[PDB]
Amino acid sequence: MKEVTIEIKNKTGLHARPAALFVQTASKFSSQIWVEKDNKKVNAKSIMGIMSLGVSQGNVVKLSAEGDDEEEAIKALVDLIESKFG
Template sequence: MVVEREVVIPNKEGLHFRPIMQFVDTAQRFAADVTVKCEGREADGRSPMELLMLVATHGTRVRLVADGDDAEAALEALSALIESGFGET
């Protein structure tokens, strides 16, 4: 099962170290493959290097794609994490 959702990076510093690590930790809790797309770039949701290379700054629109049995749950958890601003402002 493939599900997709678009979210906007709300925190000021964008997708930097701590948010990336939270994202990776969350993605790893699920079996589904997670891909993050941003302005023509693509990152594996479990690769800190690729997520960093997305250079998703504050206000960037990213598309989350999850593929697998628990895709829906994964997407729910990951978009909630992003929308919370990773606990930052």
């Protein structure tokens, strides 16, 4: 299991296209991936889960993954977030 604490810095946070890019990037991996904000942990592959988290610009979330490609999965999301979703 791999976990990372990270600040989301893009305008819309986890909303709009960035929200879709995020969901589709996690769906690329077989591992189960979660996002926690405050006290609420949701599935990173679920758009409804991400929306319910209400992640805005500047918010600090905790990404975690568990599976055969958990390291690659976390790395992929980190690189995506750090590029501010292109």
